[PDB]
Amino acid sequence: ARTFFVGGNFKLNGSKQSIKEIVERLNTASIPENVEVVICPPATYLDYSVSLVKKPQVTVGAQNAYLKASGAFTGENSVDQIKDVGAKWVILGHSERRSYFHEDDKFIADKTKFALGQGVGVILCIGETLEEKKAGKTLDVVERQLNAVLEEVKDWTNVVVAYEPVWAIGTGLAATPEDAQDIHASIRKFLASKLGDKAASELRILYGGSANGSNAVTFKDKADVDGFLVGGASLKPEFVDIINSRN
Amino acid sequence: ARTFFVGGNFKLNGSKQSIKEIVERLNTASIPENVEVVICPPATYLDYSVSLVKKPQVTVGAQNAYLKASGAFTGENSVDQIKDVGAKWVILGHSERRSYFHEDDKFIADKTKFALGQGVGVILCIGETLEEKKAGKTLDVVERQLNAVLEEVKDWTNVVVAYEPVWAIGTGLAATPEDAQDIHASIRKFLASKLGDKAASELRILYGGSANGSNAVTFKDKADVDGFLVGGASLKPEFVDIINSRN
């Protein structure tokens, strides 16, 4: 569902000294023009990055934000500052927030819509636990969580869904191209019956869960895997391998 | 004497221009000496802030950080990155995280801990809810809140305790200078031979809860009221007033 989209969720990792690597390496790079990749760094160097960036494809996003754009919110992230500072995207509902931070669907659902309110890009994170898998329906979970959003967000023109199995986030267990692609159609099917199919045709649904330079090509002709949200190796030089694999 | 500290916590406020006007006015308003201001903007405007301050009597800090300096915690702030960007402080334990973001005594504890580990001070907010208060427990609360740290922190050479009645933050409802002096005083003691007289002596106890230019002067002659955590009032000129009334 068209333009190959590659994200790098640096999580709590970095030095300005080190993101200089990252991003410089990135500016230097032979990557197509028919691409769109965003760098989701720690909230403190989201403007340094912005200033390091010298390649049209790349844009900076954020790891997380609040649902309010200013207030008595000691310790939170404002979409308005992120934009104000350069950034264009914001990751939401990552599994690192849903389990570590008891961030419910609903929060994730106000977050989402608001930010699109403010005109920022939202990379929405969904997935299932080794437990839901084994219980089979995985598709509940992703539809229970993807609904929480639908009630609120009508126009998705801006959302990039990131399908991310909790058992693959940084564990070395990527999901197989075929069950991965399988999950995506469903998603796409899902949303079809709701966002309408010209929408679902343009919606971008990404795969994340131990995507590494090496397994990137393994995915290169799957229809519903229109990208990646790479954490761990978005750090390595091998991040570029991911983007140059044509999927 | 045993040095005046007026902390300005921007909560979810600042623009690169707000932060600067704020920053230059301070850079340019006569309000010296034994005064120490640690201003605290979003993670987002942290590096710019310094850049504009750096550290005469003016130092920067962050409204929150997590308990590990690096890893996979999407969204988090990392002691180590606020250190890198030239930040010296970290508000830890404020009433906002604690209620809405539900971090707890033990959380706060393990983070004040990891926090100084890296040699960054903490601005340990302790405070009582409007019930606490009537059921007369603020001795208890505070003293419990504080125990939970104490049970992980040994050295408090670089801790600054923010005493904030939970009903005085953002309400207008300042604590009367009386009880003001009463409670600070009381815990200088409990704090006393938790860790000795010297420490109890070189250590500050901040008062916060609608602290501002006007009422600021009323704690003038309060030994034990070694300063404040200004939310609201750090966004204006009054900030300057507040650090020109001495102690």
Side-chain angles (χ1 to χ4, degrees):
Chain A
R2 276 205 40 267
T3 325
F4 183 60
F5 185 99
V6 191
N9 176 22
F10 312 166
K11 299 136 169 282
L12 210 67
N13 287 295
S15 73
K16 286 199 166 178
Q17 175 136 69
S18 132
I19 90 147
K20 92 171 280 208
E21 310 156 337
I22 298 266
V23 150
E24 236 272 273
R25 165 175 58 259
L26 235 108
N27 295 106
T28 261
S30 271
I31 48 152
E33 280 182 37
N34 37 278
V35 89
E36 155 177 21
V37 17
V38 354
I39 34 175
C40 284
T44 74
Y45 325 88
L46 215 193
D47 158 81
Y48 173 52
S49 315
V50 176
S51 265
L52 279 228
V53 133
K54 326 197 276 320
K55 281 262 176 155
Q57 300 99 283
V58 64
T59 63
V60 188
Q63 273 160 73
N64 163 248
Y66 199 50
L67 50 105
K68 279 346 344 290
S70 53
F73 309 119
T74 302
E76 227 83 321
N77 273 329
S78 179
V79 129
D80 272 14
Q81 315 185 309
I82 279 118
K83 262 180 135 57
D84 158 56
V85 326
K88 308 276 72 51
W89 291 87
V90 65
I91 309 264
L92 288 201
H94 193 285
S95 83
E96 267 132 49
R97 305 256 101 234
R98 312 177 158 279
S99 33
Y100 295 120
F101 306 99
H102 312 130
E103 285 204 44
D104 71 272
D105 311 322
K106 208 259 209 220
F107 193 45
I108 297 121
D110 313 327
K111 309 181 99 158
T112 305
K113 38 133 166 304
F114 164 75
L116 305 133
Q118 311 279 42
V120 157
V122 165
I123 300 192
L124 213 202
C125 302
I126 257 92
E128 82 331 311
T129 75
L130 178 97
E131 214 295 332
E132 15 265 10
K133 212 198 146 172
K134 330 276 284 298
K137 261 174 152 199
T138 272
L139 258 268
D140 268 40
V141 188
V142 167
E143 281 155 14
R144 232 129 56 183
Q145 327 159 301
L146 210 48
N147 257 321
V149 170
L150 275 346
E151 300 18 324
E152 324 303 341
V153 201
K154 293 312 156 197
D155 183 20
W156 286 61
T157 173
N158 262 192
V159 175
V160 336
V161 191
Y163 178 55
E164 302 190 318
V166 178
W167 43 269
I169 321 186
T171 61
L173 273 273
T176 86
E178 26 291 341
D179 49 22
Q181 147 88 347
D182 248 348
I183 299 150
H184 278 218
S186 301
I187 285 164
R188 187 166 321 275
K189 140 212 145 192
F190 172 54
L191 286 184
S193 80
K194 306 288 268 278
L195 354 178
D197 74 85
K198 154 200 181 288
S201 91
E202 266 142 32
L203 207 224
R204 222 93 45 111
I205 144 100
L206 306 198
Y207 166 89
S210 286
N212 69 37
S214 287
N215 79 7
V217 241
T218 230
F219 263 112
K220 175 203 126 281
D221 263 316
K222 288 285 137 26
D224 298 333
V225 176
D226 309 314
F228 282 127
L229 189 54
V230 194
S234 62
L235 281 203
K236 349 231 199 94
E238 136 186 14
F239 174 45
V240 39
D241 277 337
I242 297 155
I243 102 184
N244 267 151
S245 44
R246 263 333 165 42
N247 322 23
Chain B
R2 327 253 39 281
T3 296
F4 198 55
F5 194 120
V6 196
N9 180 2
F10 311 14
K11 303 196 173 290
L12 213 68
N13 304 287
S15 141
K16 267 166 80 97
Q17 73 185 152
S18 290
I19 300 225
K20 193 165 48 86
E21 262 227 346
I22 301 184
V23 154
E24 281 169 351
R25 151 183 348 311
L26 262 91
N27 280 319
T28 224
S30 81
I31 56 51
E33 311 318 50
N34 231 229
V35 72
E36 187 169 354
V37 24
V38 340
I39 26 144
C40 309
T44 296
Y45 307 96
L46 210 65
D47 190 31
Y48 175 53
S49 303
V50 352
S51 179
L52 301 208
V53 323
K54 296 214 174 52
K55 314 214 321 45
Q57 46 271 157
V58 162
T59 269
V60 26
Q63 299 135 53
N64 180 241
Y66 189 68
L67 42 72
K68 286 284 183 263
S70 110
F73 327 96
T74 279
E76 281 324 274
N77 297 121
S78 148
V79 297
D80 269 346
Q81 287 156 358
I82 105 230
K83 168 150 285 89
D84 164 36
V85 166
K88 266 182 49 271
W89 283 94
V90 81
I91 307 155
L92 247 348
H94 201 288
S95 355
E96 275 153 358
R97 326 252 76 265
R98 339 207 82 281
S99 53
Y100 332 102
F101 301 137
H102 30 262
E103 322 194 352
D104 77 6
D105 315 311
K106 256 320 295 149
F107 194 26
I108 307 167
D110 320 306
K111 312 186 206 189
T112 290
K113 235 276 182 28
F114 169 67
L116 19 84
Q118 310 299 315
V120 30
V122 23
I123 286 145
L124 195 246
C125 313
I126 114 214
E128 86 310 341
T129 61
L130 178 45
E131 305 51 72
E132 274 123 51
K133 184 195 220 291
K134 299 99 82 281
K137 317 214 208 27
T138 336
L139 93 279
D140 287 311
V141 131
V142 141
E143 168 149 316
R144 65 169 232 167
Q145 297 196 340
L146 273 175
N147 262 294
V149 164
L150 251 201
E151 155 171 12
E152 287 255 320
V153 178
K154 262 52 199 299
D155 105 329
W156 288 57
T157 327
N158 326 72
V159 180
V160 272
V161 189
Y163 175 54
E164 281 170 328
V166 187
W167 41 274
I169 285 215
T171 67
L173 249 17
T176 77
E178 57 168 70
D179 7 89
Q181 255 297 138
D182 197 348
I183 307 150
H184 290 219
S186 127
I187 86 135
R188 182 151 291 154
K189 280 209 70 228
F190 139 93
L191 278 171
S193 210
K194 274 318 191 161
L195 25 298
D197 300 310
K198 196 213 208 265
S201 266
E202 319 113 75
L203 188 72
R204 298 82 154 215
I205 286 204
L206 271 27
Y207 164 78
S210 301
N212 75 39
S214 323
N215 80 351
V217 66
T218 41
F219 303 63
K220 211 201 232 228
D221 304 57
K222 268 156 300 322
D224 253 37
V225 183
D226 324 273
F228 328 81
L229 209 52
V230 206
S234 69
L235 263 37
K236 340 256 207 64
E238 25 197 289
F239 189 62
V240 201
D241 295 351
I242 324 199
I243 82 167
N244 260 338
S245 35
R246 339 158 180 306
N247 276 279

